[PDB]
């Protein structure tokens, strides 16, 4: 028994998108979730769901909804899925095995690319252990080798943990920036805060 539409507009159409390093997380509750506006429009190239189907989204109710957003390379969109492996999955953003939700990703080369630039977006390349599901790491400490302590980036394993994609138009489709939004759902019984536009 709610009437206010969910704030999907400020999540998908937002001009700014967070880095895969320190990705953003927006909570959605107490609203009507009409998903037709998402997949009906042209710019959203890819849209996949796990545990549910795109057509059934408008007919379901959800107890809690989270909208994670970030930017990754085109070839790395594959890594955004349950049980996957790779830099983004291992060190930046990992989904749970029982993930229930959908992943929306589309090309944003026109927005997020500059000729010899686009240092806005960074990703973690070194970490001692893989992240837990939905884990977040904002630290940037140097990755000391162990045979000698480190205070700054040095030789052998003493690397600076983060790196930047440096998107440019000259890159191919695979390396071009892709704007990604991940929706997570919970399907328990009442109370339920999010429901579709049903009667």
């Amino acid at each position: 028994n709610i009437t206010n539409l969910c704030p999907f507009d400020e999540v998908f159409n937002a001009t700014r998108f967070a880095s895969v390093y320190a990705w953003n997380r927006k909570r959605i509750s107490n609203c009507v979730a009409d998903y037709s506006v998402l997949y009906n429009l042209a710019p959203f190239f890819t849209f996949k769901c796990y545990g549910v189907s795109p057509t059934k989204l408008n007919d379901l109710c959800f107890t809690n909804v989270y909208a994670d957003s970030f930017v990754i390379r085109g070839d790395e969109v594959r890594q955004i899925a349950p049980g996957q492996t790779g830099n983004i999955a291992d060190y930046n953003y990992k989904l749970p095995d029982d993930f229930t939700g959908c992943v929306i990703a589309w090309n944003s080369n026109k927005l997020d690319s500059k000729v010899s630039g686009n240092y806005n977006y960074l990703y973690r390349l070194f970490r001692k252990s893989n992240l837990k599901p939905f884990e977040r790491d904002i630290s940037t400490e140097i990755y000391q080798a162990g045979n000698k302590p480190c205070n700054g980036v040095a030789g052998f394993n003493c690397y600076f943990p983060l790196r930047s994609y440096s998107f440019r138009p000259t890159y191919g489709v695979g390396h071009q920036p892709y704007r990604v939004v991940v929706l997570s759902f919970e399907l328990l019984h009442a109370p339920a805060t999010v429901c579709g536009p049903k009667k």
Epitope: T15, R16, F17, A18, S19, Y21, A22, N24, V71, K110, L111, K114, V115, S116, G117, Y119, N120, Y121, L122, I138, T140, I142, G152, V153, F160, R163, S164, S166
Partner: antibody
Framework: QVQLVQSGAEVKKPGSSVKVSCKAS????????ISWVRQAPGQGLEWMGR????????NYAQKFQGRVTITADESTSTAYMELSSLRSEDTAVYYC????????????????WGQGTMVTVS | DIQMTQSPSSLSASVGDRVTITCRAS??????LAWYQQKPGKAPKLLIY???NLETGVPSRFSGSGSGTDFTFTISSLQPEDIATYYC?????????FGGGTKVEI
Amino acid sequence: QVQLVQSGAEVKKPGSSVKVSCKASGGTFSSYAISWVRQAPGQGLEWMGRIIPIFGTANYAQKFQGRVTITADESTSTAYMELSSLRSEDTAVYYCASLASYSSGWEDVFDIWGQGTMVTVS
Amino acid sequence: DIQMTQSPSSLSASVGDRVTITCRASQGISSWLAWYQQKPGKAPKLLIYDASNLETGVPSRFSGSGSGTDFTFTISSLQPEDIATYYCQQYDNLPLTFGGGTKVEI
């Protein structure tokens, strides 16, 4: 908090070079990117180049390409920029500023600006 | 390189008078514009970092909006502390270009 402190002013005859610096203070040097902006007397601001010391990448405008060099020194956290073959129209106030781009999802907009150095040819 | 035309070059207005400054890009930019405030003999201050996003600590008195080529920055009211020169900066592409600037006079 972040603060940028620039060196003193400089006065030179034409054909010389300048070696101004801006020392980063507060936080850690692993989180700053520096850009240099020119402002001729009474005219608008002009962007020269960008330096990201951690990634070891620098960029310059087309006019200053091959004439301005920007460097940095981690040991002293001093961002260095040099201008070669000085000529009278190079006179301007030069500002050291920190980019927001080199961070999570921000852009090139300059957040913190240095006190600026007066450079004149005479 | 991408060039921006900023008009009017100078605008004079009284206390409490609304101010409107127009910045026009020669090529379409996807809202990647920022506005700065420069007091005489002082470094520019970043007022608006995105097409409409105000920086922390900047009074809501200031505002801005626009997309594509045409952008506008406005002051809801002229306080004495608002008399300054404002520049529009485009950062869609690497060769950052500042606008011609708009000198504000009481």
